[PDB]
Amino acid sequence: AVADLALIPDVDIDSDGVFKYVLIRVHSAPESKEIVRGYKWAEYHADIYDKVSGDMQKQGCDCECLGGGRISHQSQDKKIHVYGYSMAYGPAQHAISTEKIKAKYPDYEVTWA
Helix, strand or coil: CCCCHHHCCCEEECCCCEEEEEEEEEECCCCEEEEEEEECCCCCHHHHHHHHHHHHHCCCCEEEEEEEEEEEEECCCCEEEEECCECCCEECCHHHHHHHHHHHCCCCEEEEC
């Protein structure tokens, strides 16, 4: 009953406009990392968390919301801005979110407020 973290992508983010995102920590069974998740289809951060923590359980992973905020993806100008907070989880450490994002989008100019 071994869960593989190398299979869960660190960043899974939409690609066009402004959307709420969350920084979540997945926990493997006795092993741990943080992941970026943000979608345009969610009115609230809890919605993203529900959906994602749900998928994680199917991979044998435990979830914890370490905060949230917003991502401004400007696919055109190759820019991704990370800022704000989530009212249900508080602010996320956007520095970590941008670390993983910039790693996935090197050609992009990533920043956080």
